[PDB]
């Protein structure tokens, strides 16, 4: 269910003699037996997790946290990364660049592992047959196949019905609608083929 | 026929150097093909230097000069009276006219 491989990075408990084994997300370039460092005073090497208040600008990191304590929220899929584009010494803020392109500022006390996540180029191969789409999606949920709502009955989808295959009304349904109406393009600011740019954010 | 020697420019064994843009009509042209006029001027005119010496609060002051290098294409250096068509024997004169 994940394009990225895991990692059995095992730690030691500093308060009782045992071996606590944890599961990370494997970056690209790590290997079995690498000394993975975890701390604020740790060095800046690929595979180590560091707080964002102790790294300079431009460090390509991943598995960055929103708030310090949620054990890894943002940038977890295969082949993704965020870019620290600026710091703030006052009130310990750190401005990062999310993979969607959303420049959002977070706390400097949040953590993040150095480097891009292993598994890049996964969606660059044409997943040709439906059998490869079957064995992919049967390990996730019951969301495959996807029947077109025009082809089904008027009781089954708001677009279906009629003597032809047509929607009938506008596919742009507002955000302030209720369930049962939210089909097609939910609250679209723009529609049609992208013949412009990425001017804002 | 071949009325000239380099025939358009000052390129001697290079093939291609640099394209530049004209200032009068925004025409793309090679740098050695576009003629050059280092049109050096004073920042004030000859008639505005009398009233500026009376309005100056400075005892002595050095007059600035606006230096600029601007290029012309062939089509907008002949319509504007910059260069003129010459006789067949006087093409070879490469000295600046005084």
């Amino acid at each position: 269910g994940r394009g990225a491989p895991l990692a059995k990075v095992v730690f030691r408990d500093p308060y009782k003699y045992r071996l606590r084994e944890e599961i990370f997300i494997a970056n690209e370039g790590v290997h079995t037996g690498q000394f993975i460092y975890a701390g604020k005073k740790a060095s800046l090497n690929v595979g180590n997790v560091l707080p964002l208040g102790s790294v300079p600008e431009g460090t390509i990191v991943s598995n960055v946290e929103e708030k310090p304590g949620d054990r890894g929220a943002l940038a977890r899929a295969s082949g993704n990364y965020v870019i620290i584009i600026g710091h703030n010494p006052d009130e310990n803020k750190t401005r990062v660049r999310l993979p969607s392109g959303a420049k959002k500022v977070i706390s400097s006390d949040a953590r993040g592992v150095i480097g891009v996540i292993a598994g890049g180029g996964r969606v660059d191969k044409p997943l040709l047959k439906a059998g490869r789409a079957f064995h992919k999606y049967r390990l996730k949920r019951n969301s495959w196949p996807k029947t077109r709502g025009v082809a089904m009955n008027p009781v089954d989808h708001p677009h279906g019905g009629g003597n032809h295959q047509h929607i009938g009304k506008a596919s742009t349904i507002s955000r302030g609608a209720v369930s049962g109406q939210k089909a097609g393009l939910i609250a679209a600011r723009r529609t049609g083929l992208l013949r412009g740019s990425q001017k804002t954010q | 026929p071949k009325k000239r020697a380099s025939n358009g420019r000052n390129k001697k064994g290079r093939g291609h150097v640099k394209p530049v843009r004209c200032v009068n009509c925004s025409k793309s042209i090679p740098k050695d093909k576009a003629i050059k006029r280092m049109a050096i001027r004073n920042i004030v005119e000859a008639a505005a230097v009398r009233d500026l010496s009376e309005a100056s609060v400075y005892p002595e002051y050095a007059l600035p000069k606006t230096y600029n290098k601007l290029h012309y294409c062939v089509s907008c250096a002949i319509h504007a009276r910059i260069v003129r068509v010459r006789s067949r024997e006087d093409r070879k004169n490469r000295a600046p006219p005084q």
């Binding site: - | 005119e45 008639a47 009398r50 009233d51």
Partner: protein
């Protein structure tokens, strides 16, 4: 409106498309150390006192 007089000290020549505008460098009678070239219309000799409606105006070449 104020009136400003000017005496002709030097004449340049005819400048225009049809040839009816003369470039004349006049010198003011209230200031004997400052001159402004003006464009006139009619027959102008030297040492003629003209009446200028606008005091400060630099004359260009008409085309």
């Amino acid at each position: 409106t104020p009136v400003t007089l000017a005496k002709v000290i030097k004449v340049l020549g005819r400048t225009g498309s049809r040839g009816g505008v003369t470039q004349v460098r006049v010198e003011f009678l209230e200031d004997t150390s400052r001159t402004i070239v003006r464009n006139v219309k009619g027959p102008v000799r030297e040492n003629d006192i003209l009446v200028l409606m606008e005091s400060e105006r630099e004359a260009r070449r008409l085309r």
